[PDB]
Design a protein around this ligand. Structure first.
Ligand SMILES: NC(=O)C1=CN([C@@H]2O[C@H](COP(=O)(O)OP(=O)(O)OC[C@H]3O[C@@H](n4cnc5c(N)ncnc54)[C@H](OP(=O)(O)O)[C@@H]3O)[C@@H](O)[C@H]2O)C=CC1
Length: 179
């Protein structure tokens, strides 16, 4: 089984982990408190500290909020070359001078940041997306990483919508707030 990483242990990390397992992946979780977080996951999931989880996979969902990204900054060297999937949303349209994905890319300039899955609710990961809204919008400045995340979306039974460069991340982040 291919191993996919998730940082964080909240509602989104838990739902993502469900879908990943159902779709045939092995999951490693990076948590600040893995002994405590382990009870929030099945035994088949490897729950560990961030620095250990990162050694087990090259593709990591960053299932934490933007305001906590800098808690990972000391992992910069270990994260070099890895794909980081920015799943985040904000409470306001155009909330910051840069999109959350661009902010993450600036914190980890030698990682490969891909925006994706922010439009998917926790409940949609558990039940599946509505038949008329299986779309997940994906973008990245790195074409190879973009294509890997597109293929992951397909394996998770979503319809990936390739919006090209990371410049698309801003309006992808605005989309849940628009109607
Ligand atoms: N909930 C949803 O339905 C959806 C959420 N998202 C996005 O997913 C991401 C997570 O959302 P959600 O699960 O609801 O968020 P939570 O508020 O549950 O936070 C998730 C994780 O953040 C981690 N973390 C929290 N504080 C810190 C910190 N100070 N430093 C380092 N890590 C920290 C915790 O992990 P730990 O304690 O294990 O370290 C926690 O389990 C967000 O970006 C959200 O916008 C996207 C679409 C849907």
């Amino acid at each position: 089984k291919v191993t996919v990483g998730v940082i964080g242990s909240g509602d989104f990390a838990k739902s993502l982990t469900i879908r990943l397992i159902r779709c045939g992946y092995h999951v490693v979780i990076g948590s600040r408190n893995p002994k405590s977080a382990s009870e929030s996951f099945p035994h088949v999931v490897d729950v560990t500290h961030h620095e250990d989880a990162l050694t087990k996979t090259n593709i990591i969902f960053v299932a934490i909020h933007r305001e906590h990204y800098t808690s990972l900054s000391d992992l910069r060297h270990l994260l070099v070359g890895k794909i980081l999937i920015d799943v985040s949303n904000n409470m306001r349209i155009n909330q910051y001078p840069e999109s959350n994905a661009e902010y993450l890319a600036s914190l980890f300039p030698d990682s490969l940041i891909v925006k994706g899955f922010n439009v998917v609710s926790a409940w949609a990961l558990q039940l599946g997306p509505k038949d008329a809204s299986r779309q997940v919008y994906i973008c990245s400045n790195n074409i190879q990483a973009r294509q890997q995340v597109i293929e992951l979306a397909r394996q998770l039974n979503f319809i990936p919508i390739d919006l090209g460069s990371l410049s698309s991340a801003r309006e992808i982040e605005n989309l849940p707030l628009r109607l």
